[PDB]
């Protein structure tokens, strides 16, 4: 029903991640029409989550964060009912504000600065090195704080 004229479709989201993205990106805090599929069948990955939002596009920060939460997701941009742009989210070099350094003795916890991590793509997991304490972690340990 009612394919959208202009906006965004985030596809190929892993199961149990779609709901998380809705929260983290505060996507439902809008009056724009949204449709969401959770645990949809997928030939490409068995099961998937799917988010469609009219007249709305991910901010630069949100795209950067998406590469961490769902690497294999597909961001489709739509204009005049047509897919205009399509890509897996570009991994950034740094990510600020959203992550929490798992080093409990990091100065970043007690003080008014934005968190900041050097992002480097690796073989199996992805590494996050804290700007402040200089410690590096697997994104598995940084996420699910």
């Amino acid at each position: 029903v009612e394919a959208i004229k202009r906006g965004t479709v985030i596809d190929h989201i892993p199961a149990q991640i779609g709901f998380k993205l809705l929260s983290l990106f505060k996507l439902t805090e809008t009056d724009q029409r949204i449709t969401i599929g959770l645990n949809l069948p997928s030939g490409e990955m068995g099961r998937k989550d799917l988010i469609k939002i009219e007249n709305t596009f991910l901010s630069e920060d949100q795209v950067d964060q998406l590469a961490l939460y769902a690497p294999q997701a597909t961001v489709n941009r739509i204009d005049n009912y047509e897919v205009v742009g399509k890509s897996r989210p570009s991994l950034p070099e740094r990510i600020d504000n959203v992550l929490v350094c798992p080093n409990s003795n990091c100065i970043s916890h007690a003080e008014p600065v934005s968190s900041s991590f050097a992002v480097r793509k690796r073989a199996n997991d992805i590494a996050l090195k804290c700007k402040y304490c200089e410690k590096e972690f697997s994104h598995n340990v940084v996420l699910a704080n």
């Binding site: 080093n103 003795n105 100065i107 007690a110 003080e111 008014p112 600065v113 402040y132 304490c133 410690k135």
Partner: protein
Amino acid sequence: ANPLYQKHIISINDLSRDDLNLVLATAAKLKANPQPELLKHKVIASCFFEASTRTRLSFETSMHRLGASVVGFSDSANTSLGKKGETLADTISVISTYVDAIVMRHPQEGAARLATEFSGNVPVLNAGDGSNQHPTQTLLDLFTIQETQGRLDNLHVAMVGDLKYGRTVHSLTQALAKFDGNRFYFIAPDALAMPQYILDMLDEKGIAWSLHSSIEEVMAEVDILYMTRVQKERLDPSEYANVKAQFVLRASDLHNAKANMKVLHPLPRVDEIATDVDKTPHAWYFQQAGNGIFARQALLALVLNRDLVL
């Protein structure tokens, strides 16, 4: 200007081999020919948020030897951060309107880096941040190694004790890895091993390192035996089985040491170095400490003067 003019000195990871050599060359010159007015009209803040004897006193003495003035505190309990709830950020924001540089030690990793974000054009020198970095210790350590060994490459270097929490060995290993052909021996309890990020760095540079369960195992081949204190104030309670020194160097252990070998230790020692070591020709931890004066003068001079002619 000189490469270090007006630079923050936070982490050895931000400095090149040339940077380190520049400080060592400058330190050698100041040791030979003092410049009592080099920092005349400079006022420097010495801000210590955890305990120190060597690092604070040698820093302040160094400022005085170059003609600078000193303000600050050796603990934070009577600052407005200590009694009025003030953040470190704001503390740095106001002190940096007063002084020409800030030397700071702090119990949290990253505090010095954070300070650079609020100090504007005022250089911050990291005198120790939690268990992370201790770059001026490394400067005086390199200076001492170079003085006694004649070189900073192709060395056999053992580091013993608490390598996990030793900001001293994190900085020192990184610095020595910028030189060629050095070989490392790490002798530590499993619970306090040299952290993986140091090891990965050594691997990426194709630098040889190995683990050992005893000093005697490597005594015959080391040029530098770097002893450390268990950092009990950093330990998790789950790590309290490790409070006592696991490795205790005694004079008798030196029987098969290389003649040229020096025993270093950033100090203070508890029991990891017995006092009967002090009188041996290998003991060099007090001379090492003495060298903090020339390294820290060198660093201050380079950061606060565009160029030096000496």
